[PDB]
Structure formats: C-alpha cells, structure tokens
Motif scaffolding. Sequence first.
Motif, PDB file in Angstrom:
ATOM      1  N   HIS B 169       0.828  -1.196   0.000  1.00  0.00           N
ATOM      2  CA  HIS B 169       0.000   0.000   0.000  1.00  0.00           C
ATOM      3  C   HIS B 169       0.865   1.250   0.000  1.00  0.00           C
ATOM      4  O   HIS B 169       0.377   2.318   0.366  1.00  0.00           O
ATOM      5  N   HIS B 197      -4.736   2.123   6.279  1.00  0.00           N
ATOM      6  CA  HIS B 197      -5.307   1.825   5.030  1.00  0.00           C
ATOM      7  C   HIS B 197      -6.095   0.541   5.215  1.00  0.00           C
ATOM      8  O   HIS B 197      -5.520  -0.534   5.162  1.00  0.00           O
ATOM      9  N   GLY B 199      -8.844  -1.777   3.726  1.00  0.00           N
ATOM     10  CA  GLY B 199      -9.593  -2.276   2.567  1.00  0.00           C
ATOM     11  C   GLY B 199      -9.705  -3.794   2.728  1.00  0.00           C
ATOM     12  O   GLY B 199      -9.632  -4.344   3.835  1.00  0.00           O
ATOM     13  N   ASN B 200      -9.805  -4.492   1.628  1.00  0.00           N
ATOM     14  CA  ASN B 200      -9.841  -5.921   1.712  1.00  0.00           C
ATOM     15  C   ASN B 200      -8.467  -6.435   2.074  1.00  0.00           C
ATOM     16  O   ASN B 200      -8.354  -7.514   2.650  1.00  0.00           O
ATOM     17  N   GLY B 201      -7.457  -5.669   1.651  1.00  0.00           N
ATOM     18  CA  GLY B 201      -6.124  -5.748   2.138  1.00  0.00           C
ATOM     19  C   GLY B 201      -6.051  -4.585   3.092  1.00  0.00           C
ATOM     20  O   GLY B 201      -6.692  -3.528   2.867  1.00  0.00           O
ATOM     21  N   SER B 271     -16.210 -11.932   3.787  1.00  0.00           N
ATOM     22  CA  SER B 271     -15.093 -10.982   3.941  1.00  0.00           C
ATOM     23  C   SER B 271     -15.599  -9.578   3.913  1.00  0.00           C
ATOM     24  O   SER B 271     -14.872  -8.609   4.213  1.00  0.00           O
ATOM     25  N   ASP B 272     -16.867  -9.417   3.561  1.00  0.00           N
ATOM     26  CA  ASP B 272     -17.359  -8.082   3.273  1.00  0.00           C
ATOM     27  C   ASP B 272     -17.842  -7.487   4.568  1.00  0.00           C
ATOM     28  O   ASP B 272     -18.739  -8.008   5.224  1.00  0.00           O
ATOM     29  N   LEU B 273     -17.257  -6.368   4.924  1.00  0.00           N
ATOM     30  CA  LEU B 273     -17.603  -5.738   6.183  1.00  0.00           C
ATOM     31  C   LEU B 273     -19.074  -5.306   6.239  1.00  0.00           C
ATOM     32  O   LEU B 273     -19.692  -5.358   7.320  1.00  0.00           O
ATOM     33  N   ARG B 274     -19.656  -4.883   5.115  1.00  0.00           N
ATOM     34  CA  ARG B 274     -21.063  -4.442   5.155  1.00  0.00           C
ATOM     35  C   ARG B 274     -21.967  -5.609   5.468  1.00  0.00           C
ATOM     36  O   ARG B 274     -22.936  -5.444   6.179  1.00  0.00           O
ATOM     37  N   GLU B 277     -21.481  -6.246   9.316  1.00  0.00           N
ATOM     38  CA  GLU B 277     -22.091  -5.208  10.145  1.00  0.00           C
ATOM     39  C   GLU B 277     -23.587  -5.485  10.222  1.00  0.00           C
ATOM     40  O   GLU B 277     -24.173  -5.430  11.292  1.00  0.00           O
ATOM     41  N   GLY B 319      -8.992   3.896   2.533  1.00  0.00           N
ATOM     42  CA  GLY B 319      -9.375   2.596   1.991  1.00  0.00           C
ATOM     43  C   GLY B 319     -10.876   2.472   2.065  1.00  0.00           C
ATOM     44  O   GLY B 319     -11.560   3.298   2.727  1.00  0.00           O
ATOM     45  N   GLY B 320     -11.383   1.479   1.360  1.00  0.00           N
ATOM     46  CA  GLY B 320     -12.808   1.121   1.349  1.00  0.00           C
ATOM     47  C   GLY B 320     -13.469   1.094   2.709  1.00  0.00           C
ATOM     48  O   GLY B 320     -14.571   1.640   2.917  1.00  0.00           O
ATOM     49  N   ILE B 321     -12.772   0.485   3.667  1.00  0.00           N
ATOM     50  CA  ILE B 321     -13.304   0.345   4.980  1.00  0.00           C
ATOM     51  C   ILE B 321     -13.022   1.624   5.769  1.00  0.00           C
ATOM     52  O   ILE B 321     -13.894   2.134   6.491  1.00  0.00           O
ATOM     53  N   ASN B 324     -15.430   4.409   4.465  1.00  0.00           N
ATOM     54  CA  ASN B 324     -16.856   4.207   4.567  1.00  0.00           C
ATOM     55  C   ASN B 324     -17.399   3.620   5.902  1.00  0.00           C
ATOM     56  O   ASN B 324     -18.576   3.779   6.163  1.00  0.00           O
ATOM     57  N   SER B 325     -16.584   3.006   6.742  1.00  0.00           N
ATOM     58  CA  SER B 325     -17.161   2.343   7.943  1.00  0.00           C
ATOM     59  C   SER B 325     -17.168   3.231   9.120  1.00  0.00           C
ATOM     60  O   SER B 325     -16.164   3.382   9.853  1.00  0.00           O
ATOM     61  N   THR B 373      -8.288   7.687  -0.363  1.00  0.00           N
ATOM     62  CA  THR B 373      -7.083   7.369  -1.075  1.00  0.00           C
ATOM     63  C   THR B 373      -7.319   7.386  -2.601  1.00  0.00           C
ATOM     64  O   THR B 373      -8.439   7.337  -3.074  1.00  0.00           O
TER      65      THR B 373
HETATM   66  N1  LIG Z   1     -20.160   1.529   3.106  1.00  0.00           N
HETATM   67  C1  LIG Z   1     -19.289   0.640   3.634  1.00  0.00           C
HETATM   68  N2  LIG Z   1     -19.272   0.288   4.960  1.00  0.00           N
HETATM   69  C2  LIG Z   1     -18.374  -0.594   5.435  1.00  0.00           C
HETATM   70  N3  LIG Z   1     -17.440  -1.160   4.615  1.00  0.00           N
HETATM   71  C3  LIG Z   1     -17.371  -0.883   3.292  1.00  0.00           C
HETATM   72  C4  LIG Z   1     -18.289   0.066   2.709  1.00  0.00           C
HETATM   73  N4  LIG Z   1     -18.004   0.157   1.385  1.00  0.00           N
HETATM   74  C5  LIG Z   1     -16.989  -0.677   1.116  1.00  0.00           C
HETATM   75  N5  LIG Z   1     -16.603  -1.239   2.278  1.00  0.00           N
HETATM   76  C6  LIG Z   1     -15.583  -2.244   2.437  1.00  0.00           C
HETATM   77  O1  LIG Z   1     -14.303  -2.038   1.853  1.00  0.00           O
HETATM   78  C7  LIG Z   1     -13.766  -3.335   1.604  1.00  0.00           C
HETATM   79  C8  LIG Z   1     -13.254  -3.163   0.198  1.00  0.00           C
HETATM   80  O2  LIG Z   1     -12.317  -2.127   0.270  1.00  0.00           O
HETATM   81  P1  LIG Z   1     -11.351  -1.790  -0.971  1.00  0.00           P
HETATM   82  O3  LIG Z   1     -12.129  -1.244  -2.175  1.00  0.00           O
HETATM   83  O4  LIG Z   1     -10.514  -3.023  -1.114  1.00  0.00           O
HETATM   84  O5  LIG Z   1     -10.382  -0.613  -0.427  1.00  0.00           O
HETATM   85  P2  LIG Z   1      -8.944  -0.516  -1.158  1.00  0.00           P
HETATM   86  O6  LIG Z   1      -8.697   0.999  -1.247  1.00  0.00           O
HETATM   87  O7  LIG Z   1      -9.211  -1.233  -2.487  1.00  0.00           O
HETATM   88  N6  LIG Z   1      -7.656  -1.532  -0.413  1.00  0.00           N
HETATM   89  P3  LIG Z   1      -7.074  -2.995  -1.219  1.00  0.00           P
HETATM   90  O8  LIG Z   1      -8.336  -3.809  -1.126  1.00  0.00           O
HETATM   91  O9  LIG Z   1      -5.938  -3.833  -0.673  1.00  0.00           O
HETATM   92  O10 LIG Z   1      -6.626  -2.467  -2.550  1.00  0.00           O
HETATM   93  C9  LIG Z   1     -14.928  -4.351   1.831  1.00  0.00           C
HETATM   94  O11 LIG Z   1     -15.066  -4.853   3.181  1.00  0.00           O
HETATM   95  C10 LIG Z   1     -16.128  -3.471   1.733  1.00  0.00           C
HETATM   96  O12 LIG Z   1     -17.254  -3.998   2.454  1.00  0.00           O
END
Ligand SMILES: Nc1ncnc2c1ncn2[C@@H]1O[C@H](COP(=O)(O)OP(=O)(O)NP(=O)(O)O)[C@@H](O)[C@H]1O
Lengths: 391, 391
Positions: B169, B197, B199-201, B271-274, B277, B319-321, B324-325, B373
Amino acid sequence: FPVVLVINCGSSSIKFSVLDVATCDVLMAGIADGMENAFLSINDKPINLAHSNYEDALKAIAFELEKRDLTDSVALIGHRIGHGGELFTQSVIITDEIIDNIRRVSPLAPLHNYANLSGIDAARHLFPAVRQVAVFDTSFHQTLAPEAYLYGLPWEYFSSLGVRRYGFHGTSHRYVSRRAYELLDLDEKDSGLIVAHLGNGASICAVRNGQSVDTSMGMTPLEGLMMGTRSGDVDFGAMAWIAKETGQTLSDLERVVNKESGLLGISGLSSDLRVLEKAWHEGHERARLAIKTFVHRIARHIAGHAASLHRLDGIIFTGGIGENSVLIRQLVIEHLGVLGLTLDVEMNKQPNSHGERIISANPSQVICAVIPTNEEKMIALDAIHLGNVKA
Amino acid sequence: FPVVLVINCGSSSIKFSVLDVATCDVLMAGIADGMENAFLSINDKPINLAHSNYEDALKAIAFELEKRDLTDSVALIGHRIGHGGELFTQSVIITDEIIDNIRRVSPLAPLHNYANLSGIDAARHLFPAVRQVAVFDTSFHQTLAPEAYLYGLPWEYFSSLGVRRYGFHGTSHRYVSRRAYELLDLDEKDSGLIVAHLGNGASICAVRNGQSVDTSMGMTPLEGLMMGTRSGDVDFGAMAWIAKETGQTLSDLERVVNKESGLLGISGLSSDLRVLEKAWHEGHERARLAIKTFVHRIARHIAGHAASLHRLDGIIFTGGIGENSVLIRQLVIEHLGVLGLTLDVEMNKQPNSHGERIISANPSQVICAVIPTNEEKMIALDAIHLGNVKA
Ligand SMILES: Nc1ncnc2c1ncn2[C@@H]1O[C@H](COP(=O)(O)OP(=O)(O)NP(=O)(O)O)[C@@H](O)[C@H]1O
Ligand SMILES: Nc1ncnc2c1ncn2[C@@H]1O[C@H](COP(=O)(O)OP(=O)(O)NP(=O)(O)O)[C@@H](O)[C@H]1O
C-alpha cells in the motif's frame, strides 16, 4: 518451620527451591540436569546421576532434604505447569481430576506437559501425605477477551483444535503486577500496567484493573517479541516462501525459529545479551543490529499492548534482561517518547541489588519501574493460601 | 488535453483508468477481467474477450481509446508494480534496465511480478512513442531502518535470500500522508502520522517527518492486520502445530491463511464488512467477533506503529473500509483512549461524499481524519513529474 518445595520439571531439567513458609525466603535451591550423564547440583556438591529418569532425580532431591532434616518440614509442594489450556484459570490443589485435566492439555505442548506430569507423579510418590499445588504459566491470561485471543484463522481451528492465544510467563506477570500496585501506590481495581518480562524468553502483558487483557506470546512461546534464540513475530508468507526456496519443511523451519533465531540468529554470535552489549561496544555491527531490533520490537509491543488499557499508569520491567540491562531499558524507554516517558538515568543506572525501584523522572507521563520477578515465591504463596483449604 | 493511462495488471485482471493531465480527474475507467471467458468492462459495454492473454486485453483497451479519439492524447502511461524489493525507492521512467530490475524481483512475488511485467510488455507494444512510468507498492517503505525491517531469523535469510519486511500500500500511504499535511496544517518535516489503510487488504504505516518508518505488512501481504480473507499475524508455532495435527502442508496452510481466513474465516459468512455489520445488527455472534477481533488488531498495530514516532499528530483512515465504515472507525478510536483520542461522532457519521474530513473533537490529543485514497492519481502525478525529465 514448615517449608514449601517448588518444582519446575522441564524437558532437560528439574529446578527446585525450598522456601520457608514464614518469610518465603529460599533455604535451598538446585537443579538435576542433563535428564545420558545426568547430575544433581545444589547451588555446592555438583553430584552425578547418569541415566536418571524424573522419578530418580527427584528421589535424589528428596534424599538431600532427608539429609538436612527437611523432609518433615515439607508442608506443601508447588509444581510449575507450562500449559493449562482453557482448563485452568487459577492455581489448584492437585487431585486425580487435576491430573486428568493436565493430561488433556498434552497435545498443546507434548514434551513439556509430559515432563511436568512426570514431576507430579514423582513428587506424589515421594510425598504422599503432603498437599501439592499446580501453578500454570497460562492461567493469568485466561481473562483475555476473544477479540484478544483469537487468531484470524477459520473458526474451526479454534472451536475444534483449540487454536488461540494462551500466553506464558503468567506467573511472573501476575507476581510483578501485584508488587507494582504497592510500589506505585495504585488502586488495583482502577489501573493500567504494561509488564515486560524480558529474559531468554520474553513477553509483554497488559494488566487492566488487575487482570491480563493482552499478552504477546501466542498459542506457543514463539509469538511476539524477538528473544534470545526465538524469532518472535514472523510473516507466515515469508516462512512459506523460505520453505519453497530452501526445500526445508515446517519442522525444519520450526527448529530454526525456536533455536537458531533471535538475538543469536541476527548477531551470529550469542543469545546472551551481555555478550552482545560487549560486542557492540567493540564495533560489532550485527550485534548492534540484533539489539536495536530487539529493542524496536519491545517498544512496538509495549505501545500496542497499551491499546488494551483505558489509562497507562506504569511500565514495569522484569526478568534477567529487564532487571539487569541498563542499556536495554533506556533504549526501550527512549523509543516510547510518544507516550510521554521520561527516564531518570541515575535511577536507571542502579544495579538490580536495589530491588523494586522507580526509574522514570518526575515529569514522566507514565511511571517506569524495575521489579524483580520471583516465580517460586508466587507459587509458594499460592500453595500457602491453598494450604488453608479443606479438600 | 493530454491524458495519462494508468494500468494495474494483476493475476486475474487489468484495471485501468484514464486521467486528464490538467485536473487528474478520471475520464474513463474499466477492467478486463477473468484473464477462460475473459471480458472488458468500461464502467457500460460489459464486452467479451475469451481466452485473452494480457497483450490481448490491453489491445482491446487500446482500441476502446482509439474509438474515443484518446489515443493521440495519451502522453504518459503509469504502471502499478506490486513489488520492487530493495531495488526501487521511488517511481521511475521505464527503460530496459528497469525491466531487468523488475524481473530480478520475480522470485519475491512470482505470479504478480509476471502479471505486472506482462502489462509493461503489452503497453510498450501498444504505445512505443509514449513515456511509461513504474510506481511500486513497496517503494515508500524503503526508508525503514533495519531494526524495523529485519525479522528475527538467521542473518543468512536476510543477506542471501532478501527476507525482510517490505510493506505494501506504499502508494496509498504516501498519497494520503501528503494530503494529511495540508488537511491538518502540519509541517511535513516535523510531523508524526499513522495511516490506516483499511480495505480488503489492510495495513498501517507510521510516517515520521514525511518518511515511512514502520509498516504492518511484511515480506508479503499476509503479515500484520487481520483482513477480509487474510489471517494477519499468526504464531508460527500454532501454524506448525496445525500442520502436525491435520497433516496439511505449508502450501495447504498458505492458501488457508490467504484465502479462507480473516473476516471470512472467523465469521463463517463473508469478507465483506457491510455484510458483517448487518449480520451483527441481527444477532450473529461470530460476525460480531470477526469485527471486534478486526478492530482489536487495528488498534494494537496503530499504537505499536506510534512507537516509531517522536510525536503523534494524526491518525488518518483510508481505503474502502477506512473511508466508509462509521462503526469501524469509532470502535478503533474508542479502543485508543489511552492515546487521548476524542471522537466527534457527528463528524464521524458523515458519509464519504464529504471527502477529506476531520473526525476528532477539539479536546482530542491527536487529530483523527478520513482521507480518501487515490492510487491512480498518485501514479499519474508521479508520471507527470517524470514527464518533465530528459531520458
Ligand atoms: N459503506 C461501507 N461500509 C463498510 N465497509 C465498506 C463500505 N463500502 C466498502 N466497504 C468495504 O471495503 C472493503 C473493500 O475495500 P477496498 O475497495 O478493497 O479498499 P482498497 O482501497 O481497495 N484496499 P485494497 O483492497 O488492498 O486495494 C470491503 O469490506 C467493503 O465492504
Ligand atoms: N547484567 C546483565 N545485563 C544484561 N543482560 C543480562 C544480565 N544478566 C542476565 N542478563 C540476561 O538475561 C537473559 C537471561 O534471563 P533469564 O534468567 O532467562 O530471565 P527469566 O526471569 O529466566 N525469563 P525466562 O528465560 O523465559 O524464564 C540473558 O540474556 C542474560 O544475558
């Protein structure tokens, strides 16, 4: 003058101390060692045993106390147990049930369990009308919450195989944390301590309101801090990459990570911190690196364990290294300027003869201290408390 | 209106964006995916490729830009490279030498290197009079000192095999940390940030005076935080114990730790945080545990990374999480009361449409923020700066 006999009956040795019940002072100590040419070594007589099993070494130890007219003063025997799984949350009076339950832990640490159980069987033979107590290195950590003890493995590994963080040095962490409430004048029920037990084995523990809430070793003693010969935390990806590249197996790598790594592995020289401190003083770059790395991973785990506290009141050093290494303690503390630590170097310079001692200067946000650990005394205290019970 | 084409050419996909050079806004994005039935999917036309190699997918992408009369506006191409070992400390203009040096990294991440190099070969074919730039996920972390990058393995593993922490990252951590100096009005040269950071990573990074000084992933992306499907830090003893007990090999376990663990592995659900939750909200205990565990390991690594800073000015989520979380950020922050954090929950509630935003209340000892990011934009900025150079 009743005494407690304390036994730590490991894979190669039986260490023992005899403690007076009144003062908990050591009256005699020793070690049966090399368990083809085994031998008994009371602090004096470096006497030979050869081909001796665990019951033999202990019968030898029993005869040395018979020698000194101690046998009839032995009111209690305390056994150090390496691993109690989820079954033991406090020290216990040993009964058939406790033995059965220790045996069920066997798979978690097979040779060390076997040795501790061999010492129990021996002592039960040698002292049948004496109450015996089991004190477990894992049991203090049984207050960890699931978020702190689980690995990120499939749930099945935890629920079916009992894969989870246990932690070790529990008996030291517990003893030192109790002494800390007195030394620092803290209310136990409203308090946050990090204890760094730095020896050849090393671990951190966060004690919140008198209970362990995080600790650095894992399911086994290999996790966490870098140690004398143990790697500490290591990327499993890196370990799997190494396997593929060198053709070594998990079993090969496990030996490497337990016996050739750590201070030894980086330095190329020794696991012994005193040798390394002197090597660095002489320009040895790898020794300096081994130390800086050691220090960096200590600081990292200390601050990380702090996250399990609501308030950080104290950081307490203990163990061979925590008690005696002036340089290690100062480097660690200077690595935690972020937490507001201020060292009083003159206090940090004092040797371990000074005992329980504060080493932070007044302006420090967190009190830092050195508290000599005493696992034998802790075990004896448990034994003595348990000596008042009707079984 | 020159544009940059940004390519991230992984083991299953080629993601791309086309960014305007003036504003760095995205003009077009897409993904060639499934690389037996491959297909191209521009944000519209979900069109099919089937049996397509990397050069095919990219020729397809090139024709879509030819389509839209973009081809002649492509002034620069930026390639995301997964791994640059110790060879790359900054983004570079790609030449034969750079290609040779990327190839020497191959053994460190063989399939992902191969894919990134396949994308380079394809783009060099499709755009020969266009300057191309390589931007490496590892390179920001090359300022780590040896005490922070070494494992406690025998020195030989480092000096002969290049076993050491790399971190990933980097391009996100770097981008976010630059935006943070502006958002928080900090002097870059006198500053301490932790970036999470998530995300899924997921990884943490400590940035001291503009440089990375610690990061949570290791030689590979498996170390550190628990993630979507990755275990994060796991006791090697426990992994070796599991092997002996189940008869699985390192290779078996590696797949488990990379693909079946983490949020997925604890939850048994996703694996999906949403999804998790929502499961917790419905009484699912294992989902709650997966989350609490996730949170606990984030707090632990954040505080631990802080130890590499002289002063903690900010904690920044991304990151995604992280972006958004709402719940994850608040739970993390409440787990760091020890560092003096105070959350403004109304600010923490704002959705990610609000962009770069402070979420700590005034009394907070450390500023907490959310910074979206933008790795594509970072790569394009590097490319544009490199576009001024005489090669
Ligand atoms: N509204 C939300 N609430 C909670 N989690 C979310 C939300 N939107 C996306 N995510 C989470 O973000 C994760 C995906 O993140 P991601 O798009 O991978 O971030 P990133 O910037 O790509 N990091 P990497 O995955 O290693 O490249 C999953 O758990 C999603 O559920
Ligand atoms: N004066 C000293 N200065 C620096 N290090 C020392 C000193 N004395 C002993 N040590 C170190 O302490 C380590 C041995 O510690 P040890 O006796 O194992 O503590 P402990 O309480 O036994 N923990 P464990 O080893 O797991 O049971 C070795 O590195 C010794 O070099």
